[PDB]
Ligand binder design. Sequence first.
Ligand SMILES: CC(=S)O[C@@H]1[C@H](O)[C@@H](COP(=O)(O)OP(=O)(O)OC[C@H]2O[C@@H](n3cnc4c(N)ncnc43)[C@H](O)[C@@H]2O)O[C@@H]1O
Ligand SMILES: [Zn+2]
Length: 272
Amino acid sequence: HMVPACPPPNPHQVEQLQDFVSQSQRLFVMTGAGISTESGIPDYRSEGVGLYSRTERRPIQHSEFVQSQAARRRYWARNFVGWPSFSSHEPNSAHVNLCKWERAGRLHWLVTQNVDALHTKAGQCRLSELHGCTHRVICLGCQTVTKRSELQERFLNLNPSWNELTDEQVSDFQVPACTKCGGILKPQVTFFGDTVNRGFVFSIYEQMKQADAMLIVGSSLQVYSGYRFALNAKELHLPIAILNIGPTRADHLAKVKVSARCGDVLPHILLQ
Ligand SMILES: CC(=S)O[C@@H]1[C@H](O)[C@@H](COP(=O)(O)OP(=O)(O)OC[C@H]2O[C@@H](n3cnc4c(N)ncnc43)[C@H](O)[C@@H]2O)O[C@@H]1O
Ligand SMILES: [Zn+2]
């Protein structure tokens, strides 16, 4: 399964993370793909187990999606097949506990790199989805945003022989067009080489200014899109803590690092 193996969790690290969280009133939290491996969603870079470490998965480049009809067909045919299982994943105790922390007024804001909607399903309201969400679809022509669940029905009517990975296998596969303008639809996620909207970025940094600490959960921070927010914490003179099984790009900035499954540790952190 998808959770990398980890030595047994060290109690002293756990204690230091508690003390970190106790010192905070306005925690800024960043999560990545490690917070959803316990929900059955694989991560990308866990050594020996992530999609890029262990498999032939290559992300799609944005510019190829935008410039090639055939690339769009291959993308969408795979996304169509995977949607019923992908859409059925549930939040795990880590997402649930972060939502508790928000209810208690101790989590100031959370940013995720994940596109899986799990923080939303769990009920995290003070949330930014840094890379978007696969449950939303956007037209490249008019910017209208629709629900992915609604697109599925449309895929079924257009490709009824698929209800009975190369260009040849995808020939009988047609992609629904935008119903407002006839333009190209895309999952409202940040593909490789596309960049996050600068006003959105700027609004997340604005939430940081009032935090008093940062916690990173379940990200390698290898992608600059996420690591920049740890850099920003350091510029704000915020203490940083990490709860992550493998190494991260921010390990040198952290005051406290807990190498442990996040669903084993978070339920133990108390707010009183
Ligand atoms: C634009 C897009 S969607 O980019 C995606 C993604 O948003 C982005 C950033 O990736 P990430 O940091 O979210 O994911 P990854 O680099 O795979 O790191 C996940 C980390 O989680 C750790 N981990 C694994 N399961 C656990 C666990 N249950 N408890 C605690 N630690 C865990 C792993 O050790 C690993 O260091 O890169 C991709 O191309
Ligand atoms: Zn449109």
